[PDB]
Amino acid sequence: SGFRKMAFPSGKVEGCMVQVTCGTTTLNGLWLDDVVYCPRHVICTSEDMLNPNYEDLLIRKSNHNFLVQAGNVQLRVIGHSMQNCVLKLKVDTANPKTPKYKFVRIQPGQTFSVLACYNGSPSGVYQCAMRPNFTIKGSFLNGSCGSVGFNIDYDCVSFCYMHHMELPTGVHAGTDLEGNFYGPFVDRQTAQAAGTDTTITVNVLAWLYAAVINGDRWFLNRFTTTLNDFNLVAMKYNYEPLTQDHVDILGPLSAQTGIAVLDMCASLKELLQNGMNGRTILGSALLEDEFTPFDVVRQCSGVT
């Protein structure tokens, strides 16, 4: 009973968080095995951020300039390199708390948990989605850079995001753990505006299935539709076009509830056209799009 925006337990990730300082800049790092990963802008001054030449700024830095502290103990830096927009600091000690891990580059629409940190210390955990415009709507303040996003498959942590910056619009941009930005963003204090933030249709449908499972059924109607007809409506409302791949991914939820995917689409179509009329669905007055079909099945089945 009940449906919440649930994050993965963060313990495995808390054991990897460190503080990295270079000059007067302090941010978070991720310590996995004998490498600490962090945003390369740790080498910048606030003056440098307008147009930094990272290769040139990095020439003036040695191993002893990167101060890495895991809790209250100092790690010895024996190597450093830049990979895309991240620095990799080789330390002389493997993190004894290193979980089983992978680095993944997620697709827009996929969700993940963020462990927001400041000065190497965890402050909170929340659930996110990579928006279709490759931004994330996070909760980050100055000093949160280097905080990571991840998913957990039983004992394996798949790191998918590292926080780098906030756009002047209040949304967030960052990289995968290879240092490649999601979207067109660059690690520079320049005019960067995000594209259209479209709604993740397959996630809204998954959340409608979660609502039916939990007893919120008022929006179910007597109608059906086709993918092409639904997509005419999805386009008008800045919703992602629904494909056969999305329908197939919703198959298990359709089977569990007995509500055909296209009938759920017709319910969604009427909700777009008429709104909620002051009603709520799973305690929300808007259509939620940050639960994937996998998230709904996981939460509705009790996977640990």
Ligand X SMILES: COc1ccc(Br)cc1[C@@H](N)C(=O)Nc1cnccc1C
Q: Which residues are catalytic?
A: 41, 145
Quick check: 161 binds a copy of itself (CB under 8 A)? Answer: no
Quick check: 289 binds ligand X (CB under 6 A)? Answer: no
Other CB atoms within 10 A of residue 51 CB: 8
Return d(Cα 216, Cα 282) in angstroms, integer: 7
Interaction residues for ligand X, span 16-55 (CB under 6 A):
41, 49
Quick check: 215 binds a copy of itself (CB under 8 A)? Answer: yes
Return d(Cα 166, Cα 138) in angstroms, integer: 9
- Please choose which of a copy of itself, ligand X, none residue 286 contacts, taking the beta carbon within 5 to 8 angstroms, the exact cut-off set by kind: a copy of itself
Q: Which helix (H) or strand (E) holds 205?
A: helix 201-213
Burial of 142 from C-beta contacts in 10 A (0-12 / 13-18 / 19+): exposed
Name residue, tokens 């067109």.
184
Return d(Cα 150, Cα 179) in angstroms, integer: 15
Quick check: 303 binds a copy of itself (CB under 8 A)? Answer: yes
Quick check: 176 binds ligand X (CB under 6 A)? Answer: no
Among 63, 74, 84, 139, binds a copy of itself (CB under 8 A): 139
Long-range contacts of 239-242 (CB under 8 A, 24+ apart): 239/198, 239/199, 239/201, 239/204, 239/272, 240/109, 240/132, 240/198, 240/199, 240/200, 240/201, 240/202, 241/201, 242/201, 242/202, 242/205
Q: What residues form DSSP beta bridges with 77?
A: 91
> Beta 111-118 vs 121-129: how paired, if at all?
antiparallel
CB of 245 to a copy of itself, least distance (A): 26
Among 48, 187, 216, 263, binds ligand X (CB under 6 A): 187
CB of 238 to ligand X, least distance (A): 25
Name which of 163 and 246 has its Cβ closer to ligand X.
Answer: 163
Return d(Cα 18, Cα 39) in angstroms, integer: 13
Interaction residues for a copy of itself, span 229-288 (CB under 8 A):
275-276, 278, 280, 283-286
Name which of 140 and 230 has its Cβ closer to a copy of itself.
Answer: 140
Quick check: 141 binds ligand X (CB under 6 A)? Answer: yes
Among 86, 117, 162, 165, binds ligand X (CB under 6 A): 165
Among 145, 261, 264, 296, binds ligand X (CB under 6 A): 145
Name which of 11 and 251 has its Cβ closer to a copy of itself.
Answer: 11
Quick check: 131 binds a copy of itself (CB under 8 A)? Answer: no
Quick check: 98 binds a copy of itself (CB under 8 A)? Answer: no
Quick check: 142 binds ligand X (CB under 6 A)? Answer: yes
Judged by the rule CB under 6 A, the positions of this chain that interact with ligand X are 1, 41, 49, 140-142, 144-145, 164-166, 172, 187-189
